[PDB]
Chain length 368, copies 4
Amino acid sequence: EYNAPSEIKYIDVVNTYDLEEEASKVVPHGGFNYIAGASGDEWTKRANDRAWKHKLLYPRLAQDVEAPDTSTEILGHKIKAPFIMAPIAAHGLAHTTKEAGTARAVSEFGTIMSISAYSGATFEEISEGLNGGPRWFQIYMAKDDQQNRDILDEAKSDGATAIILTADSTVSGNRDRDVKNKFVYPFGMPIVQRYLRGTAEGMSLNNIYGASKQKISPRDIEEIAGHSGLPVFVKGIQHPEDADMAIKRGASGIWVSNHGARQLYEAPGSFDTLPAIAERVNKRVPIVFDSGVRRGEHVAKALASGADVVALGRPVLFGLALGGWQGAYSVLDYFQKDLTRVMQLTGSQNVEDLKGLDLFDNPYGYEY
Amino acid sequence: EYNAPSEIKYIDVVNTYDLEEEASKVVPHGGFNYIAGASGDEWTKRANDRAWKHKLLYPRLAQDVEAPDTSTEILGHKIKAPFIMAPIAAHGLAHTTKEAGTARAVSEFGTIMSISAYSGATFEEISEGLNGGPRWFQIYMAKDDQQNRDILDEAKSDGATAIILTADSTVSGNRDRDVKNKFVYPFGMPIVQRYLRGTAEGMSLNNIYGASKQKISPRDIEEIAGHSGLPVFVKGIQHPEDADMAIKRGASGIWVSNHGARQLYEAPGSFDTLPAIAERVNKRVPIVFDSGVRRGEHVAKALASGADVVALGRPVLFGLALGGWQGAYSVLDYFQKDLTRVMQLTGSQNVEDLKGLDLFDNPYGYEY
Amino acid sequence: EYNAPSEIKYIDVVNTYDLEEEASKVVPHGGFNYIAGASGDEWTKRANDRAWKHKLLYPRLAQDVEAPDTSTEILGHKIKAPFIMAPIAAHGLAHTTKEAGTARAVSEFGTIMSISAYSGATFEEISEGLNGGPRWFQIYMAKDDQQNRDILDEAKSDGATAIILTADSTVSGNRDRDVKNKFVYPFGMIYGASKQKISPRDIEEIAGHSGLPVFVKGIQHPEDADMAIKRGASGIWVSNHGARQLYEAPGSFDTLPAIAERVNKRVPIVFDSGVRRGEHVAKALASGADVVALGRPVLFGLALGGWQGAYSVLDYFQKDLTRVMQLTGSQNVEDLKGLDLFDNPYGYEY
Amino acid sequence: YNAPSEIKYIDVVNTYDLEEEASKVVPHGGFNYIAGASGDEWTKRANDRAWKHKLLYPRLAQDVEAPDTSTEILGHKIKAPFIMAPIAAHGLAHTTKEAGTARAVSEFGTIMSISAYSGATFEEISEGLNGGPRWFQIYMAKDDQQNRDILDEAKSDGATAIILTADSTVSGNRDRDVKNKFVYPFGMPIVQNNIYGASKQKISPRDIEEIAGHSGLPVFVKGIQHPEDADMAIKRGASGIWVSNHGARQLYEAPGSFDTLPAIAERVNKRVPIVFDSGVRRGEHVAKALASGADVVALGRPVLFGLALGGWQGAYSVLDYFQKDLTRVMQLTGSQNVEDLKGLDLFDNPYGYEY
Ligand SMILES: Cc1cc2nc3c(=O)[nH]c(=O)nc-3n(C[C@H](O)[C@H](O)[C@H](O)COP(=O)(O)O)c2cc1C
Ligand SMILES: Cc1cc2nc3c(=O)[nH]c(=O)nc-3n(C[C@H](O)[C@H](O)[C@H](O)COP(=O)(O)O)c2cc1C
Ligand SMILES: Cc1cc2nc3c(=O)[nH]c(=O)nc-3n(C[C@H](O)[C@H](O)[C@H](O)COP(=O)(O)O)c2cc1C
Ligand SMILES: Cc1cc2nc3c(=O)[nH]c(=O)nc-3n(C[C@H](O)[C@H](O)[C@H](O)COP(=O)(O)O)c2cc1C
């Protein structure tokens, strides 16, 4: 029955906040609120957003800066801007073109696609959208070790150059919108189907997580690293000691995230946790940051705070809903141009310059 | 004619906050507002709730955690979760099965019932509900010493294995709702009738507190302990010197509480007072915490901050209003499952692990 | 033309904040807003109110306290509770009985009436209400020395036991309500007619001429407390004029500790600007004040019920403070002065 | 483009009200060009709320009467410690344009800052000024010789200082203008929507050396928020520091301008004068800026709203409002003169705007 939008078009993006209410008009109610909502009464989602006001950028002048360069490299991938696509389940909730739509946007823009293990599209379908573009695969682990070896082998054969272990979802967050909507997936999840008691199609996220592994330990990081022979990111980190644990267990990257506030409730805004994590990582491996990035100023602040790249999520999926691959592309294009302005005004010629920026501490918070 | 709800059934519970509005639909106006309301313009009731955003939980990963155990023990009672029922007067305002209904819920769930001296039900009617389950008796002291000895004897005979002295209500708080509604009890209080010079039934709360003891001193604690031979909690503690006072006077537990913000106004949120009290207590006796617990995240935060258990109040009474014993049971069950999720996500295998959690300090407020 | 309320009745006071809205319905718009309004967009008036949430009271248990005594003494006067009436001219906006109505409430209650030298009522009307009760007189400095000597003499002659010199009003505050309402005070007995160039000698000279103890009123900076005492002020009145004067200044309560620290108990401290609750009286005492002064809530009581309505507000404050003493473990007023307070760095939204 | 043309004195109870009043007489695009700021305007609101961070003390028995607002800056005697900020395109607000503003300013008795993006010629503004003092604000061209030309034509007009605005190498993200598709409805004679783009991006400390080297005049570097930039600009030959965030129209999610001022003033250490702008709306704000290290403030938006409502007379009503508003504040804070204001204690308010 599920009526996702199908129109493909470029969209004007004045800011990404506006994209939420615009997408609400064309995405089915249940799937829309699955995308936009968060745990509890969403205080931690708001904290993700308001955390950006805690550290403020300085305009800098006579900086000898012209035509700032947004390109950077991560684990040997040359990318057009210091952002990648976050792994997000079930893109068919936003658009009929689903993950193949997002992939085409990401590949044509020139950055990395993260593929969710809970994708509604097959590796084949996503691949067609990517048309050779770089991809990282995000695993939600099976309890069965051989099923993990199989999923990993499949992802690597498909072209994955890194594995993302998402470990902050051993059980579902208390997502009140989905409870109240009795939200259930309107389609299957071909990559993890093998460990579900049928198809994801009738099921709640609660029961899908939880078919997944609960008893994740540092051993799983060493094992995934060992088996795949690929660099492994550990995703969902908010406490510095977990970054140290992950690196000691063989991780090649740290991915700071609170899952866009969809997991543990009454936790800090993700940005506030980043400096402590970056201090503990001590440059040993690259850091991806996510959860609340909406503006070029947010990309800059994350890099100035110890991140190497950020990952984008909800705004790209809202762009997807509004215009397919072209809509998603408009959002990526927006972020690149937004960051370019910020770079010029802050005195940053290149991405490495962003990493060195002074930030103004704002002890007053949001209301100032 | 007090028309209290009488239907008995389990209820859903997405969050406890929503229970308040739902119960307002079925509880008479005067009694509902007596349960819901607090002192002054209720700024301190809001402070109780907002204090939970001062200390934030970290999600933790690769912890090596599966199927967390919420069971614990207090003063020798094995309980199924680290929460007990708070002593609350006049449960007949919420539901026709009154205190016997709450007792049945509490006993079936498998935790401790606290019986209010201002119960609308007799020890006998409660005992029927408890069916042998553990109970603690909360006294509001008579001015007459013999009457106290008799109340305590009756409590101990009925099966009480601890006594709670509530000492923060020697006069009533400024409860604006009840003044504006001219609230008065619609039924009697059997346990304390002996000192009311009549029945609680015509009476304002102002005047029932007024009949109880005002000149409580540390000797009262010693005398209750000496007479009953039961461990004594002192309830209402917000200042660390009161913890020292109480222990020196023979108390076997400290119960940190601001009476659900129903007493002194323009005081701190209760959770903000707990660390100073726990430091002062220095593990000499158990600590019970209450005043604003609404979520599994709050149980975890209270324990991480030096409580051994928490006491639940308003949400259980709204639950009783909505479905009698089964509705109250649904609330207890919600808290146990809510805590179980929180334990999985924070890395806590058992209740003692919650007590050692790191908390992120949030110096910004509620508005972040 | 001015049609103040004239009805005389006791009123139920659940809290004093509700009294403003209630009063607005029986007092002419212009006059009502002259009473209620403050400078600029009234951010400092809100600061006076929200400052109370910066220091929070503890409940205290097993304190051996039974029937707290609210009574106290200030420069010789035995009063039933540690609050007095603040000097306000224009009670006539609130009620036909003007300053005489408030004087009667204050006298029957058993505390001190501060009488402005600007009052719309004649002293003889006022003296009827006072019925022997104590009174202090508030003045502004005139530009003309003989006017001052004359007004001072008149105050002494009228039974005054202290002089309150208000010096925070050398020019008016920027009161937007009064400007937008084109409000014109209708009664006889301004900032500009009075003395602008007030110096410490003015206090010395008022101290010399009057036999009486002099309060300096409007203090918010501790250096002015030093200055005043050195000049023969027998008391410090901490006030920001109900936020009707300097805009974008601190809430009055936030200034109290630093001033009390400097005064070092040399002279009594009266605190005002924002008192609405018994909790507020407790908090001001715990922070260094000896008594507080009441303003707006009494005037709203006067609008609603004349002397009886005003008495209902004073009675409210006494019973409110009495609850706060019982629960904080204070047997008496000296106990309030020694209370621990909880620091709330989160402020109003917590 | 239907700019208002009515000339009259106006009532000013406060400058905040002027924004809604002007909205009713200025065309939608132009008005929102003037009123608007970057992003969701959080930093514009920060500019305003920053004033609640440091609070004035009233003071008693201070021996004060008839406060003197007059001061002096770079050899100019002005009647109050404020000047007119350089604002583009005054014809958006009123048909009399920069000449209307220039008249109010000159008649009130302070300094006119002329924007490189003015829609009036030097000669039209000169007529409004009638010999009054003027400073000129340059948006640098990419060609060195054309800057030399502009600076010559400015100097020859009578500019006694040069203001280099260096915080606009590209435009801020002004959502109102994007949504309205704002385009200028008239020319800019001094430099003749993609302007900024044509102007110089790669500004360096060399440029400020070269502007001072070439022109006669003391150079202000405008748009400073970071104390390292004030040091840089002094090292480079600037004779003045102009602390500004361009009224929040440039970098978004940056501090309110007033919160940056003490750190800049400390680093300047009285080496050169400091002009402060971005959010000044009350006499209390002029006071607080001077108490925090500024020598004068620059006024922007309220003056333009005044111009929209009453041409030169409206603009004058605003300048007069600020002068009287400051006078009251001076009386109540115990300040006899401008130097007094610069020594005032401020109460620190760690609580927000919400207190
Ligand atoms: C609709 C939705 C689905 C998501 N699904 C996954 C998932 O399959 N795997 C995963 O690791 N993260 C998932 N995430 C979390 C994202 O990877 C990322 O952490 C989050 O989108 C960042 O927050 P933001 O989009 O608000 O900026 C999901 C997020 C959303 C919005
Ligand atoms: C309706 C109502 C009645 C109460 N009656 C009593 C009482 O009889 N004895 C007592 O010690 N505490 C009483 N309390 C306080 C509770 O024990 C407990 O401190 C409070 O409910 C905790 O706040 P919360 O329910 O908002 O979490 C009462 C609270 C409310 C809600
Ligand atoms: C309407 C009004 C008139 C006032 N008139 C005077 C005045 O006559 N002389 C004086 O010293 N203070 C005057 N005050 C200030 C009061 O004495 C006192 O400082 C103020 O009422 C305290 O603020 P609050 O009433 O909000 O608590 C006046 C205040 C208001 C409300
Ligand atoms: C309509 C508008 C146009 C402006 N044009 C210029 C400009 O041409 N050159 C410049 O240096 N500053 C320009 N500014 C910034 C002002 O010089 C000044 O920094 C700002 O107005 C101060 O903020 P405020 O008006 O909100 O107090 C402009 C500001 C606005 C409001």
